[PDB]
């Protein structure tokens, strides 16, 4: 398993090295999104939490298509503010409940070291 702690001060740095295969080895959920909210990466652990099939959601829009319960000021609101701003680093609790058993999680969003992309990291609380 890949040894990275949820909420770590340098997380963008550590995941920078990591291929889709290395992302699957994390203890928590990880999704890589572009600036428009399209899914670029989606790990096994996020899969175990939500029930989505990872390979199948890559290419879809997280806010419109996959996860419309996050299309809210308290989630997407903050995302788009971070993208406009070019800086983003926030952690909050949320409940995921679209076509699934409602599941409370801790959500951490952060700008990646790349370019114009963004991470969403998820764990159970």
UniProtKB/Swiss-Prot annotation:
It comes from the Bacteria. One of its GO terms (molecular function) is identical protein binding. The keyword DNA-binding does not apply. InterPro entries: PAS (IPR000014), PAS-like_dom_sf (IPR035965), PAS_fold (IPR013767), PYP (IPR012130). The modification S-(4-hydroxycinnamyl)cysteine is found at residue 69. Keywords: Chromophore, Photoreceptor protein, Receptor, Sensory transduction. GO terms for biological process: phototransduction; regulation of DNA-templated transcription. The keyword Isomerase does not apply. Photoactive blue light protein. Probably functions as a photoreceptor for a negative phototaxis response. This is Photoactive yellow protein. It comes from Halorhodospira halophila (Ectothiorhodospira halophila).
